[PDB]
Amino acid sequence: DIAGLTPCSESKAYNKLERKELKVLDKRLKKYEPGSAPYLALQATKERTENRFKTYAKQGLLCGNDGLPHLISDPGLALRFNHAGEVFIPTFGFLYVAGYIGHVGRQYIILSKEDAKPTDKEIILDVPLALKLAFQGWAWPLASIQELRNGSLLEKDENITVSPR
Amino acid sequence: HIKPSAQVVWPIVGQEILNGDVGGGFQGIQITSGFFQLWRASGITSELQLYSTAIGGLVLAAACFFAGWFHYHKAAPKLEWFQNVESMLNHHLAGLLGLGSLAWAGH
Amino acid sequence: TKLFPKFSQGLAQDPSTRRIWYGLATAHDFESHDGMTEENLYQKIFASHFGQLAIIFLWTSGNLFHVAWQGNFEQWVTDPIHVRPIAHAIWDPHFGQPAVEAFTRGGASGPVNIATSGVYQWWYTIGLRSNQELYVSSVFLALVSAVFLFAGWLHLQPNFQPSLSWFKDAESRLNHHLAGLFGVSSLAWTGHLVHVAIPESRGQHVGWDNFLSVLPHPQGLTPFWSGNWAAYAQNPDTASHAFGTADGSGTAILTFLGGFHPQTQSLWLSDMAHHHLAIAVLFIVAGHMYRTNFGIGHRLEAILEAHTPPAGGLGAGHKGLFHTVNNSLHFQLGLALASVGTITSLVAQHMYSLPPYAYLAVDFTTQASLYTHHQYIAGFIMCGAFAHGAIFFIRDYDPEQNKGNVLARVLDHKEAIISHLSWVSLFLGFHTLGLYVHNDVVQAFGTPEKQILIEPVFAQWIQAAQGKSLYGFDLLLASSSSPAYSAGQSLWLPGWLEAINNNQNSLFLTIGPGDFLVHHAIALGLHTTTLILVKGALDARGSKLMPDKKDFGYSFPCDGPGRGGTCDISAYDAFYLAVFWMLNTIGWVTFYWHWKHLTLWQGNVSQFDESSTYLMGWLRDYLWLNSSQLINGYNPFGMNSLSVWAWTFLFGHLVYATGFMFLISWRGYWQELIETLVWAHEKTPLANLVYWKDKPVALSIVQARLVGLAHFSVGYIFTYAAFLIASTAGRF
Amino acid sequence: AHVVKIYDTCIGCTQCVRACPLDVLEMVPWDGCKAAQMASSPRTEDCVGCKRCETACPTDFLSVRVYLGNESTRSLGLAY
Amino acid sequence: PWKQPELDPDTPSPIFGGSTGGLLRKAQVEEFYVTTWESPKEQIFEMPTGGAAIMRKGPNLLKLARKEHCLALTTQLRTKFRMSPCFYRVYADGKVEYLHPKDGVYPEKVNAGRVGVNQNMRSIGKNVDPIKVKFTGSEPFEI
Amino acid sequence: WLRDFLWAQSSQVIQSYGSALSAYGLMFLGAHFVWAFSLMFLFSGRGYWQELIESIVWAHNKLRVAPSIQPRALSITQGRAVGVAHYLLGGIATTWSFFLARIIAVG
Amino acid sequence: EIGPKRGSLVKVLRPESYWYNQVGKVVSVDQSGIRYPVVVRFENQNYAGVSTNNYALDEVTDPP
Ligand code: CLA
Ligand code: CLA
Ligand code: CLA
Ligand code: CLA
Ligand code: CLA
Ligand SMILES: CC1=C(/C=C/C(C)=C/C=C/C(C)=C/C=C/C=C(C)/C=C/C=C(C)/C=C/C2=C(C)CCCC2(C)C)C(C)(C)CCC1
Ligand SMILES: CC1=C(C/C=C(\C)CCC[C@H](C)CCC[C@H](C)CCCC(C)C)C(=O)c2ccccc2C1=O
Ligand code: SF4
Ligand code: SF4
């Protein structure tokens, strides 16, 4: 109960939104026979709606004055209270994949640059080396840290094109 | 009383709301091309006939692609063949347009 | 050879129609004028500044005269909550009979126009009651405008033109302006406030006939010569007090209760009196700092050269920078414009939450128009500041004069700054648009609980630190045991806490996830505008595509189709592209302000809280719902007073579209069309006798961008002002 | 009219004079290059600033530079 | 060239129809340009301001309102037929000017008979900043 | 024209959310996006974008992810083509979504 | 003879050049005493499209 947001399990507007969605979904149910395939699809949609409302509740999620769940972004506050699953763990979850793509792109760029006419390698990809680097990029932050200390990651600006101001 | 519909979406991510209640115990995207009106003008009753038309169209599409491959890579016409403007006009006036119009009138 | 461009002989040699446009555009670009020295340039700038001052004073004198003549200021004074302000009468002979009848608003006889400028609230707050006083104000401001015009004429004659070093006097100008232009000016303002407005707010008329017979405080300056300044805050105005009378009032001239007046919904007059008195005292103290003819003071170059951190942190530090600011007028202009725009933005963000005028918060359209006007003024002044900084970088910048200093080092790694600005702009735009589109489609599938509502925790945490107890954070100044709450607990805490915990006012409104998303979109707009303006400023003199940009002037079209294409390569072009992003960003901030305040005034804040998350709801409940009264101004069935607003809305659309006409098409197709029209006129009967003297030529590319930007911004401003005023005034 | 300047970086491919359809540029003998040639602009008052010589210039940076400003009836390309 | 040639009033002109693109009132008020060449036979060329015109075996005469039209026609003739023509300028008072090479062997050659003008011995980018030449009337590239 | 055609109609496009035709509202706003995104390629030029690309190239050069192919800004004709294509696609999809939603929710 | 070896990799320090702080290959060095005798070839084109340029003696040093 932070920032004046009630939990989703004990919110009246959350349940009123659930009842409203169940009402409109059951409105379309009266136009089809129960043994039809649109009825089965509508029943599966209603089951997915009920499962989503149940799983969104009782998970630490909270909402305020709207019936729509809110996300807590401050670290520590999302760690002392059970809210790290909203954005805190997705932050490291995205950064792992984001650093994965950046690392395999860097290794492919470095590997292709030590080859005759490297401009062709960007439009003519090679599969075995790219796929080998794709499956050799799980430890991207471990390769990134070791290259940072020793200068292989970076480059001094004496061989870097700089503006003539 | 039944709105036409010929595109059915998947239930993957919230798209089940797009399968609108078009009537006739069917749900899908309400189409706007008017293909149902054309299939009522050109007398078409069952879905078997539409299946046959689709398979024939696929066969003619494969034939057209093979024709392009043949008429370029295998047997390419010369410039004098393309410069026969009178034959082109006669064959695409009497042949293409006229033969298609007569075939459609007969159908 | 003509002489209409007198400042530019070369422009007078142009036989085409380009001479008139370029003569009008380079009319006050004195630095590029033919045969102009530095001292005469500074003197011309002094005369032009005096002319602008005279124009400003004449404009406000005319505003006073028009309000005193055709306004309803007395009726507004008698009843501010009911009677509407009136700006000027409408004498348009093309008006119809229903048109005259439908514009006699505010209880008037003739056709009049409702004032949204807010001068009625301001003049009622400062003690102006009768229109005689407004007439005297108008004639006095006209007199001072004539005085300023004469002074501008005075400093152009021999034995009166100041020297070059007089303008370059840096320490004494700062001393005098801080001490006098701010200090004793604020002291005179708070003296006038205490003498006139404080008794006029308590039913005591103070004028030039009797201000020497009445007294501001009953103690009569005995607190000032003694130390007992607490006597001035002994009996402040109570909660049950009216601004036009003395019902339950007190005799206090300087107080600090804080908060707002319970009746007028505005800051207390004595609060502003002590505020301007303290600001006056502090500014007079700070104005005795820089070095003058006397042996004491501070020298600017000494402070600049002394502030060099060791170990090469800033290289040479701020050394060699005094002459850079002094010699380059564009540096001073850019700094002044940056500070003016920042202060204007601060003003916009601070009058709406803290209304300084009585019954200003009640007038919703007045507050909205004032906020939007000063925000757009601040943004345009920001764009001018960055453009003139680029002009400094290209025109007058010597790397040899300041080598290794902060300026040269900033220019040294300019690519890093531009790249990081581009990264943060791209990242903000990518993620903000991602969640906006995500919440749009999630709302479209009939399930709005799946949208990503990131609750703003940092700003609500700040609001809890500032006294908002709605969020329930156990923080300082919100808990009774905190030292921040105990400090000032009897000074201004119970007023500020009562004002900030009341949701009916505009002080620190509650913010939801949509508020957070629109705030980060605003940050994205500021970041992208900063990115383009900073990149144009740093690339103003050199770039890898074109190192010699300093040799082509600040405002040049291009370099040609070579090297892949060099379209819009100038820093002027960077400014011209940045004005569009400035317009979009201020449109975003004013959309946010207008929609949140409109939902506050209508009482349905839940609609804004649940509808500002997704962009379709933004469009539907702002641009479509509030425009119902706008487009019904002159409906064929019935026409009402919103006819000027719908007409101005469509006018802004048309001028926006003419801006598009100048912006899409470029010169080179237009030259051939104009050549065909030349052949049409020259080679026809009964019209070949009439021949042009200036040759018709197409608009130049820089001129094309300028006129496209001008029509774009004019249409943008007019259509948004029309929509905002019509939407706010149709309901209330 | 416009100002056309040629710097010492020119080495004489005699192609900047072919790309100019206004006879502004001419080629003079020189000694600072292998080709012993250097571009010159005798009729610089007849230039419009079309920068075709800049497109034809192969040196980095360009040896020939055209600067806009002070336009006239011939530099504006009007036949009227 | 070896001797500066003066155009002859007697020379014929190619047969052409009425074209809207041509001489304007600037020919009357200001100067206009005149192009001359000597032909081996009757060939078809395209004027820079009109359509197609059959030219005369022998001398020919073209009048163009702009010098750019004259050099466009010159380049077209030199590319298509190795023609090598020359154009002139005729002022309002009757003054005749020679702009196509005064040396006569074209700007593509050198001829060791022309003096370098508007040439800077310094490198591009070595020019001083505009602050160093401020309030002087001289541009950095004009030094 | 404005009030009684573009405002009297399109009330079903904005309220299409939660219904069968909400995809038309999504398409409407995406068309607004693409129509508005085109004005970059229409108003702007190439030299500013080339200099920005140079700064980004320096950023990628600092930590050695420099592509072998040199990143260049779009050509002036290329930029005009991108601008007109995005503008036309956005306008066509805007009118398509508005027309189809209005004629489906009413007709 | 007066310049670097033919075919050796060199670094260009010309500020206004596109290849500032870049590495190029020497293709020819003129011995006639001209303004810019050191002619080098670069692997990457400029914005114009060319790949070779000439520089003076003071603008060419060996890269580290
Ligand atoms: C207690 C020990 C101590 C400490 C902590 C400092 C600390 C400091 N001194 Mg120092 N000082 C000391 C002892 C100490 N000094 C002694 C003994 C002397 C001799 C008397 C001095 C004399 C001295 C002088 C004369 C000056 C300083 C200054 C400074 C400050 C700037 C340092 C610098 O190089 O810039 C930081 C280093 C940089 C390389 C700057 C990088 C800045 C980046 C690029 C900007 C990033 C912007 C980024 C986008 C922002 C994002 C924000 C977001 C909202 C957008 C720094 C805080 C300077 C000062 O006043 O500055 C405030 C200064 O002029 N000092
Ligand atoms: C409303 C229309 C609109 C939009 C959306 C943009 C968006 C953008 N402009 Mg802008 N601009 C506009 C109008 C617009 N502009 C106009 C009218 C002008 C006046 C000429 C400018 C002038 C201008 C300048 C001068 C600059 C920008 C820049 C930018 C970028 C800022 C970075 C950012 O916010 O993150 C990204 C923002 C986004 C909106 C993301 C768009 C991409 C999304 C994810 C869709 C991608 C495609 C999608 C995955 C589907 C794939 C298939 C599809 C391609 C078919 C961004 C790409 C700056 C830039 O590019 O520097 C980095 C810059 O310097 N613009
Ligand atoms: C994997 C290669 C790679 C790497 C490591 C980087 C790294 C960087 N770029 Mg770059 N970028 C790349 C490709 C790459 N970029 C491509 C392909 C483009 C063209 C679309 C750009 C366009 C671009 C711009 C316009 C900007 C950056 C910026 C940045 C910096 C910010 C980090 C970031 O996420 O930027 C954000 C990057 C993007 C939004 C580009 C995403 C495109 C995809 C993800 C790249 C695909 C590469 C591919 C999968 C690799 C092949 C794998 C191999 C096995 C075959 C950083 C130095 C910014 C900067 O200057 O910061 C200082 C900046 O303004 N980049
Ligand atoms: C009467 C004979 C006849 C017929 C019916 C056609 C029909 C056609 N010709 Mg034409 N053509 C003919 C004689 C004929 N040609 C002659 C004599 C010449 C030489 C002068 C040409 C040279 C020619 C050129 C150069 C081009 C055509 C093209 C086309 C097609 C235009 C597409 C269209 O409008 O949509 C109508 C589309 C359809 C009706 C789809 C069905 C297509 C079927 C399979 C074609 C069957 C007709 C064919 C003549 C049957 C004999 C071929 C046999 C060897 C299998 C159309 C199918 C264009 C093309 O490449 O398309 C092939 C084209 O650019 N024609
Ligand atoms: C008080 C601050 C201030 C000062 C002292 C200056 C002074 C100067 N600036 Mg700066 N500038 C400012 C604010 C300021 N400007 C702002 C706010 C902007 C952003 C809009 C700019 C943008 C800017 C640029 C981009 C350039 C200058 C230039 C100049 C110089 C000449 C401009 C001039 O007078 O031409 C007189 C110009 C006119 C008379 C034309 C007026 C047309 C206006 C602007 C269009 C308005 C639209 C519309 C028609 C208005 C009427 C509405 C309609 C419905 C009736 C001069 C040094 C130029 C320079 O240094 O020369 C190279 C230059 O390139 N400035
Ligand atoms: C281009 C250029 C230029 C320009 C620039 C600009 C235009 C800028 C701007 C800038 C800006 C516009 C800035 C701003 C800033 C700000 C700041 C820096 C602020 C701060 C603040 C603070 C620090 C606060 C604090 C506090 C307090 C006191 C109270 C409450 C709480 C708190 C804590 C928040 C020039 C001329 C130089 C020249 C060169 C180039
Ligand atoms: C923005 C802009 C650019 C810069 C634009 C460039 C360089 C083109 C960028 C094309 C991108 C790289 C295509 C691919 C886009 C995304 C990477 C696709 C993402 C797909 C997801 C699945 C990841 C110009 O070059 C330009 C030139 C002339 C006039 C106007 C402009 C102009 O406005
Ligand atoms: S800008 Fe054009 S007309 Fe002028 S010298 Fe260059 S190529 Fe010739
Ligand atoms: S195009 Fe440039 S480098 Fe080549 S001969 Fe002409 S001026 Fe010299």
Side-chain angles (χ1 to χ4, degrees), chain C residues 395-671:
Chain C
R395 272 199 190 166
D396 35 28
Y397 170 73
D398 221 16
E400 299 92 345
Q401 293 177 335
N402 44 226
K403 201 180 89 52
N405 74 317
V406 285
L407 209 36
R409 277 160 96 82
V410 175
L411 206 52
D412 184 31
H413 61 72
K414 61 186 219 188
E415 319 98 6
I417 295 181
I418 295 158
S419 63
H420 284 55
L421 258 166
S422 161
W423 164 82
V424 62
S425 77
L426 268 164
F427 152 72
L428 287 156
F430 270 149
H431 275 67
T432 317
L433 171 81
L435 298 101
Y436 265 116
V437 166
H438 172 103
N439 302 339
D440 256 35
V441 56
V442 152
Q443 196 90 21
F445 291 157
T447 167
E449 72 272 353
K450 292 167 51 181
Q451 73 196 10
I452 312 166
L453 293 197
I454 313 196
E455 178 85 359
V457 278
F458 303 147
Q460 286 166 355
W461 172 81
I462 289 185
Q463 251 167 343
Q466 296 218 28
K468 175 146 271 294
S469 87
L470 184 131
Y471 315 122
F473 291 131
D474 204 358
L475 217 40
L476 88 171
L477 178 137
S479 58
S480 294
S481 74
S482 86
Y485 176 73
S486 70
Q489 193 180 353
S490 72
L491 289 166
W492 66 82
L493 255 291
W496 170 260
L497 285 193
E498 193 262 333
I500 208 183
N501 297 332
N502 188 228
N503 271 31
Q504 312 310 300
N505 47 63
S506 310
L507 181 60
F508 278 103
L509 320 161
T510 53
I511 38 179
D515 282 78
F516 152 82
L517 290 176
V518 80
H519 267 207
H520 271 252
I522 289 165
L524 152 74
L526 301 194
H527 263 278
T528 285
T529 308
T530 305
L531 152 73
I532 170 181
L533 283 170
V534 157
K535 179 204 148 306
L538 293 162
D539 293 19
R541 43 190 299 110
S543 73
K544 189 52 62 182
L545 184 50
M546 222 189 50
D548 52 347
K549 196 174 299 175
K550 50 182 191 305
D551 303 353
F552 281 77
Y554 173 71
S555 201
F556 67 100
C558 70
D559 207 10
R563 306 185 311 276
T566 49
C567 306
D568 296 17
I569 206 150
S570 77
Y572 166 79
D573 287 89
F575 155 82
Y576 140 77
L577 298 185
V579 179
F580 303 110
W581 256 93
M582 188 295 325
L583 281 156
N584 166 81
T585 308
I586 306 297
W588 283 352
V589 313
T590 52
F591 272 27
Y592 175 36
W593 198 100
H594 185 205
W595 194 21
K596 186 161 188 65
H597 277 258
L598 208 61
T599 49
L600 184 60
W601 300 324
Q602 292 176 154
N604 41 84
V605 288
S606 83
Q607 157 167 17
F608 173 74
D609 273 329
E610 81 212 355
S611 204
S612 83
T613 279
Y614 63 112
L615 293 168
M616 180 40 105
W618 249 101
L619 157 71
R620 172 180 63 244
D621 308 297
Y622 186 63
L623 304 174
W624 180 87
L625 168 68
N626 311 329
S627 172
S628 46
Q629 299 161 332
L630 162 61
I631 59 200
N632 294 0
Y634 40 84
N635 195 287
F637 313 131
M639 171 285 239
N640 54 351
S641 64
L642 307 159
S643 310
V644 201
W645 309 119
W647 206 93
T648 306
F649 188 73
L650 287 199
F651 162 84
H653 281 292
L654 188 46
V655 182
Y656 186 87
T658 323
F660 270 38
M661 148 84 88
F662 289 113
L663 275 189
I664 302 331
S665 54
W666 284 1
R667 177 200 160 121
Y669 147 84
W670 297 109
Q671 187 68 31

Side-chain angles (χ1 to χ4, degrees), chain D residues 8-11 30-34 54-55 57-61, chain G residues 14 16-19 30 33-36 46 50 52-55:
Chain D
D8 64 332
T9 40
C10 179
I11 43 57
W30 201 36
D31 57 29
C33 78
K34 180 153 199 31
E54 295 204 357
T55 70
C57 215
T59 62
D60 167 58
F61 216 43
Chain G
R14 186 181 271 192
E16 87 268 12
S17 159
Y18 165 69
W19 295 283
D30 211 355
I34 59 173
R35 304 283 212 276
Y36 311 103
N46 62 342
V50 314
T52 168
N53 205 7
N54 36 35
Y55 303 104

Side-chain angles (χ1 to χ4, degrees), chain A residues 28 32 38 41 45 48, chain B residues 16 19 21 25-27:
Chain A
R28 320 180 54 203
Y32 304 90
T45 291
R48 268 192 304 269
Chain B
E16 317 95 52
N19 281 335
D21 312 325
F26 191 78
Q27 47 175 37

Side-chain angles (χ1 to χ4, degrees), chain A residues 101-102 104-105 108 125, chain C residues 419 422-423 426 430, chain F residues 56 59-60 63 65:
Chain A
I101 305 150
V104 299
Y108 188 78
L125 263 277
Chain C
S419 63
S422 161
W423 164 82
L426 268 164
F430 270 149
Chain F
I56 302 332
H60 285 80
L63 49 89
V65 286

Side-chain angles (χ1 to χ4, degrees), chain C residues 330-331 334-335 338 342 382 385-386 389-390 392-393 407 537:
Chain C
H330 302 294
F331 204 95
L335 268 174
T342 325
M382 272 309 147
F386 271 101
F392 149 75
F393 258 142
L407 209 36

